Amino acid sequence: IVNRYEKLLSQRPEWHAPWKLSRVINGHLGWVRCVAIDPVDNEWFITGSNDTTMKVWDLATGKLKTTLAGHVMTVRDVAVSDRHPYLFSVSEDKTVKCWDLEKNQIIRDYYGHLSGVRTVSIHPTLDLIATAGRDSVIKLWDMRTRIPVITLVGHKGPINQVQCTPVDPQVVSSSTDATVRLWDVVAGKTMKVLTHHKRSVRATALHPKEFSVASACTDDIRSWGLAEGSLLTNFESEKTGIINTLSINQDDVLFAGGDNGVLSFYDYKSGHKYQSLATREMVGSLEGERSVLCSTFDKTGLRLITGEADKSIKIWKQPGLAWNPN
Amino acid sequence: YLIVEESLNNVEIVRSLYTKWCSLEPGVNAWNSFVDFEIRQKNWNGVREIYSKYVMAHPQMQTWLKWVRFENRHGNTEFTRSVYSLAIDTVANLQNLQIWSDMEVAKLVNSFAHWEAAQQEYERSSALYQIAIEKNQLLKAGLLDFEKQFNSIEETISYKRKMEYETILSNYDTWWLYLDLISEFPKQIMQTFEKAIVDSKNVQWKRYIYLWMRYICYVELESLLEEELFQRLIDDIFSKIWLMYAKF
Amino acid sequence: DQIAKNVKLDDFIPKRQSNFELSV
Amino acid sequence: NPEILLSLRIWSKYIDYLEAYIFNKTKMAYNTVIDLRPAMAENFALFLQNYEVMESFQVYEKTIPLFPPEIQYELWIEYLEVATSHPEHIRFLFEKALKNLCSNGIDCKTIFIAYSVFEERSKSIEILRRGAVIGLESRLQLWRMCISKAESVTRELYQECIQILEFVIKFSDFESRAREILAYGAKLNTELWDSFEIFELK
Amino acid sequence: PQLEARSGAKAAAYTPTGIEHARLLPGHTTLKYRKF
């Protein structure tokens, strides 16, 4: 309609600074298909991989702190907790393990997932984590009693990212069924099922200050306030690659990594793509490989960290692009 | 669902369904289907409304054309005209670039002009083209076409101007200048000629000489200017030119 | 009518696209 | 009505009758027929009964609107007729025609030649050159035209032709620097050799 | 043959068994915390 387009044209987005590559830390001998940082501090960030390991990394130096070898198969995801000094990690060996960070050694392997487990999210407020695998089910664990407390049946296929919010919409799943769910853990049921994607929403992330949750199928990055479970915006992601990552920055600077490796940045809520970045790879590696598989920002937000399939981790420092809608 | 309804031959329900479908900003195809259905039904009251709705939902100039075509098929000439006006008005109204390509608007304008021509009164077409010009190349072309169809002198002049512009862009030059002069307005033509001269190895020299000669001729037709030209030539530095100057 | 009730237009519409200062 | 059904012949017959035979009425009828939708016939009629160029122009426009290979041909014919009858406007028309039929296949070269002729009555030469460049038989014709123009800047034209494409040999012959040309021809030839020999002798 | 690849996994909830798994046994009842 003309009534909306005109309005869109009238409104302007804020000039977010562009992004330039800063650090590249070829250290893993495998994909680096998870990355995470400490809520409390931003000194280190760990990165689980197809190595089977996960390595810890000092941001400032870029130096490899230490390794951790508590899986058999490849690590798919990790989550350092704000409220406790535990690092949860999870691998396609079906193990959702829990590393003490006072001793850097596993403690509570949680057992229950029938098959390769894709993501963890620690609940920001509770002493409870949430994991989901190709199982097609998101189980919540009491961390003390290392048992699945509840489980969330709804989904009809493998479930990827499964973020935890502190409100009522306490889990924000995202499947290959292309539904992204909002659940009520307490009710033992769904509350609202965002079906707006076309394909496997293989990426989703909570906004820090804004109580919303960007989510990405093969192209269209939707983003939504999950209070009602209502759409907020659609991003200009029109011919970008298969969106692997979908991290959001503190300053409303949503990042999206592709299977292409084209690092695409967007103003959040606007839905305005305001940068593209061509990937890079090593002289030995192939041009098809290069692809940002996992990524996240620091708590401040000036450094984006992208794990790419070059067996690398690339950290990114910081005139905006013209609007032009449909 | 629609086909089932058709088979049944209960039509109100089908209509309702169609309406519902069309409220969900569906495909152009759906809209077209709906239109077809409406046509098939006896009434042509409501079809217009639906078309309007479609247009509103799909700001696309092809839609407008389609609507017009329906109008044409229908008996009323006034209605078609009104529709055209509305289309034009809508295009005008969004001055901001929230728009279908400038080719599509041009096309629409052309169509309107054609319609007008087919109708009794031609002034209207001319007016429309003037309006178009005021609010580019495509538009100009359309205007020219309209003129041809039909004022003729004016059209010719416009064409000449366009040609001159093209030549300038490319940059024959002398010829262009001459044409401009002819078109003139006279003052403007003269200015253009002067500019050309200013703009203006052996071949180049020859061209320059020719230009100078032309200028001299112009002056004659119209002494100080000639003197100035001579001075300029001298500075640049021919014998023939000097001789001519002396004679003058 | 029932069908219409079942699926509404505002679902397809993003809410932020109209109002930017609006924040959840 | 037509759509519903889903006359022309009858209309044509009527038009013919009118032509045979008031003039204004006939013209109107013809116009109506055109609208409903021969062009050549209309043009002929215009030429005959009206001694009017406006009608011819209209016919040409109609033909253009109709648009195809036959249509193109008709347009060309109309243009020719106009030229025969009686400059800037003409040039513009020619240009338009050229644009329309960039690679029509049938007689692009001929059209170009015609345009050149019209221009003549440097521009013509330029046109010829363009044709030679942007245009197998047809191409050859264009080349020939270009050569002719050059003969009538010429050197430059020849060079251009050579670049585009035997041609080299021809250029050398024309020239007859000559030695260099001959050499060039040889690199890219029976008569060329002879020419070279002659040059050597002199 | 029946040596066959696959399409999808599963997750269906039955009545719990009440079996004393070895790993499930208590351990690290104390959860640590951060300083703030």
Side-chain angles (χ1 to χ4, degrees), chain A residues 2-209 211-326, chain B residues 1-48 50-52 54-55 57-65 67-68 70-80 82-135 141-142 186 196 246, chain C, chain D residues 2 20 29 38-39 41 45 65 68-69 83 87 97 105 114 131-132 135 150 178 183 185-186, chain E residues 1-19 21-36:
Chain A
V2 303
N3 299 126
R4 280 67 179 282
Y5 199 111
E6 75 181 335
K7 202 164 197 186
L8 274 165
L9 274 206
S10 83
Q11 292 168 304
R12 303 282 283 113
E14 61 269 34
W15 173 27
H16 294 332
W19 296 82
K20 66 181 174 63
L21 186 55
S22 73
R23 192 60 43 74
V24 174
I25 331 174
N26 288 35
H28 281 279
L29 28 78
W31 277 13
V32 196
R33 79 195 338 297
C34 184
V35 179
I37 50 135
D38 329 319
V40 74
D41 139 276
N42 302 342
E43 200 276 339
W44 75 92
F45 74 89
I46 80 131
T47 54
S49 56
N50 286 339
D51 304 43
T52 297
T53 67
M54 60 196 76
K55 301 185 162 183
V56 186
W57 301 100
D58 287 340
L59 283 161
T61 54
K63 254 60 171 63
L64 202 179
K65 251 181 159 166
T66 183
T67 56
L68 299 172
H71 299 283
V72 187
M73 218 150 134
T74 75
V75 186
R76 194 40 70 93
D77 190 284
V78 316
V80 172
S81 292
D82 60 324
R83 288 191 68 264
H84 14 279
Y86 300 149
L87 147 62
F88 294 90
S89 52
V90 68
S91 299
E92 304 119 43
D93 60 13
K94 315 185 190 188
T95 66
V96 194
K97 303 227 176 200
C98 175
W99 305 80
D100 179 29
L101 301 165
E102 275 80 339
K103 209 245 288 183
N104 302 330
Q105 222 101 115
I106 56 153
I107 316 167
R108 330 124 193 283
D109 183 22
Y110 304 146
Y111 160 78
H113 277 286
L114 329 201
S115 33
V117 188
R118 293 269 193 281
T119 52
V120 192
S121 191
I122 64 102
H123 205 118
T125 58
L126 296 162
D127 272 279
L128 165 146
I129 87 170
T131 56
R134 62 147 81 186
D135 278 29
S136 194
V137 133
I138 147 67
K139 318 211 89 175
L140 309 199
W141 308 92
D142 178 24
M143 298 183 333
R144 175 165 54 80
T145 64
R146 52 181 304 177
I147 50 125
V149 194
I150 62 129
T151 183
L152 302 175
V153 73
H155 276 315
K156 285 156 65 186
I159 147 174
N160 306 288
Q161 271 60 17
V162 67
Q163 306 312 309
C164 260
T165 30
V167 72
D168 166 54
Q170 277 143 320
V171 183
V172 179
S173 300
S174 141
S175 76
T176 217
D177 315 317
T179 56
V180 342
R181 298 268 165 131
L182 299 180
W183 308 91
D184 301 337
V185 38
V186 69
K189 216 156 190 66
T190 51
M191 53 160 288
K192 182 62 170 60
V193 45
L194 304 157
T195 59
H196 306 231
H197 297 279
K198 285 169 196 171
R199 308 206 185 285
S200 65
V201 53
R202 60 153 63 183
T204 162
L206 300 171
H207 192 283
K209 316 182 89 69
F211 190 51
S212 305
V213 59
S215 65
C217 51
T218 188
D219 251 294
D220 55 280
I221 292 158
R222 269 57 146 69
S223 303
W224 12 49
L226 42 292
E228 203 286 321
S230 185
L231 212 166
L232 249 58
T233 193
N234 300 334
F235 286 42
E236 287 182 297
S237 46
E238 306 302 326
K239 62 174 178 63
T240 193
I242 298 151
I243 299 294
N244 283 318
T245 67
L246 226 210
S247 46
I248 287 171
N249 200 7
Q250 193 195 55
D251 300 10
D252 304 29
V253 185
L254 169 149
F255 167 70
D259 274 336
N260 295 339
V262 66
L263 277 88
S264 187
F265 292 88
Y266 315 71
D267 277 60
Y268 190 78
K269 298 222 291 296
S270 80
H272 170 67
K273 179 177 153 86
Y274 83 92
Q275 207 190 211
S276 300
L277 246 292
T279 345
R280 197 54 52 130
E281 75 303 318
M282 321 328 300
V283 66
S285 180
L286 59 136
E287 296 288 351
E289 175 163 285
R290 36 148 268 191
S291 167
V292 33
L293 301 170
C294 186
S295 74
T296 188
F297 296 91
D298 297 351
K299 300 296 290 188
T300 53
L302 303 173
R303 301 287 181 282
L304 172 64
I305 315 156
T306 56
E308 314 201 343
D310 308 310
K311 309 155 210 164
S312 68
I313 45 196
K314 312 203 177 194
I315 314 177
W316 303 85
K317 281 172 190 171
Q318 299 177 301
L321 272 56
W323 192 291
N324 305 146
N326 179 48
Chain B
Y1 209 142
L2 292 157
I3 71 156
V4 169
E5 274 15 65
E6 259 64 294
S7 80
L8 263 281
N9 207 247
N10 190 16
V11 78
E12 185 269 330
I13 189 65
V14 92
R15 187 184 272 92
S16 78
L17 173 150
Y18 249 130
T19 314
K20 150 46 27 161
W21 189 12
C22 270
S23 80
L24 307 178
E25 270 202 60
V28 71
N29 271 40
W31 282 108
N32 292 331
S33 312
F34 183 24
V35 123
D36 272 39
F37 148 79
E38 287 280 294
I39 287 165
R40 188 167 55 262
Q41 262 46 59
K42 305 205 305 308
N43 74 322
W44 287 283
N45 310 324
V47 59
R48 213 171 320 287
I50 91 93
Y51 239 122
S52 160
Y54 171 11
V55 165
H58 291 238
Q60 194 83 310
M61 204 46 54
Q62 39 169 201
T63 310
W64 285 107
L65 294 180
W67 189 12
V68 162
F70 164 63
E71 251 66 85
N72 276 24
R73 281 193 193 76
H74 189 58
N76 284 234
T77 57
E78 47 138 305
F79 272 57
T80 86
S82 186
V83 168
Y84 262 117
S85 308
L86 214 187
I88 286 234
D89 277 25
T90 207
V91 186
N93 279 8
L94 67 97
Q95 203 74 58
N96 31 230
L97 279 282
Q98 40 161 122
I99 201 190
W100 54 89
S101 56
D102 201 63
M103 175 53 188
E104 287 276 26
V105 61
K107 183 176 180 181
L108 168 68
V109 170
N110 180 248
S111 66
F112 196 8
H114 280 217
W115 154 253
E116 287 297 312
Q119 257 267 120
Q120 69 173 222
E121 38 190 50
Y122 229 105
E123 292 300 326
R124 294 307 186 87
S125 328
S126 191
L128 148 141
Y129 265 119
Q130 286 165 26
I131 293 169
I133 66 165
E134 191 172 22
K135 97 186 183 196
Chain C
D1 304 311
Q2 2 288 187
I3 176 55
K5 172 200 93 296
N6 205 316
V7 49
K8 42 178 190 286
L9 215 185
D10 78 318
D11 290 17
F12 297 84
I13 297 158
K15 294 189 74 277
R16 216 276 183 154
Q17 68 102 259
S18 65
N19 309 312
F20 272 33
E21 65 108 315
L22 174 135
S23 184
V24 186
Chain E
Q2 74 69 214
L3 275 28
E4 278 176 321
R6 57 183 280 185
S7 314
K10 40 138 56 117
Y14 309 81
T15 184
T17 181
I19 207 166
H21 285 311
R23 271 58 122 59
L24 176 58
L25 285 174
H28 314 272
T29 52
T30 53
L31 297 162
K32 294 266 192 69
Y33 291 95
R34 256 73 184 285
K35 198 165 63 55
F36 284 111

